[PDB]
Amino acid sequence: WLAYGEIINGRFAMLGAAGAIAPEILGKAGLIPAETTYTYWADNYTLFVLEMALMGFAEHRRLQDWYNPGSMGKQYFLGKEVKNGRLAMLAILGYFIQGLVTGVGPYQNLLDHLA
């Protein structure tokens, strides 16, 4: 719905993707390079973000299949309050921007750090 209910999760949610775009390095895209070693890519050889289907399906419905009821658990298995959190909604928005809107991994100095 909800409302109000859909912030905490949004909180945790973007947090990891935001977490992607900071603790990274990175390494592709590419673009600009070359876009698409380990084995090569080992990465299957080409086009495989459809495990996401299953996977990004497998967490959100698997979250909510919850709901405490949770069923989804199941039988067995052995085959100002928008003011606060919602300003917090902004300052997390934001530092996607500067953590993206220039390169971070600068690594421009200053000195050197490894090297």
Partner 1 sequence: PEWLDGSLPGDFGFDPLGLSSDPESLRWNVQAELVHSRWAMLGAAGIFIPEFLTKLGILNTPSWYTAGEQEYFTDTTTLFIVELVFIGWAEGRRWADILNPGCVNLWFDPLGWGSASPQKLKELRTKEIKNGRLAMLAVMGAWFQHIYTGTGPIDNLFAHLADPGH
Enumerate binding residues for partner 1 (CB under 8 A): 44-46
Task: Tell me how far, at minimum, the Cβ of 11 lies from partner 1, in Å.
Answer: 35
Check whether 61 is labelled as a binding-site residue.
no
- Nearest to partner 1 of 79, 106 (CB atom): 79
Check whether 11 is labelled as a binding-site residue.
yes
Task: Tell me how far, at minimum, the Cβ of 12 lies from partner 1, in Å.
Answer: 34
Q: Residue 45 and residue 8: Cα distance in Å, rounded?
A: 37
Please check whether residue 92 is in contact with residue 17, taking contact to mean a CB–CB distance below 8 angstroms: no
- Nearest to partner 1 of 44, 84 (CB atom): 44
Q: Residue 89 and residue 3: Cα distance in Å, rounded?
A: 15
Q: Is 7 exposed, middle or buried (0-12, 13-18, 19+ CB in 10 A)?
A: middle
- Nearest to partner 1 of 46, 68 (CB atom): 46
Check whether 28 is labelled as a binding-site residue.
no
CA-closest candidate to residue 12, choices 82, 59, 50: 59
* Binding site feature residues for chlorophyll a: 6, 80-81, 84, 86, 98, 113
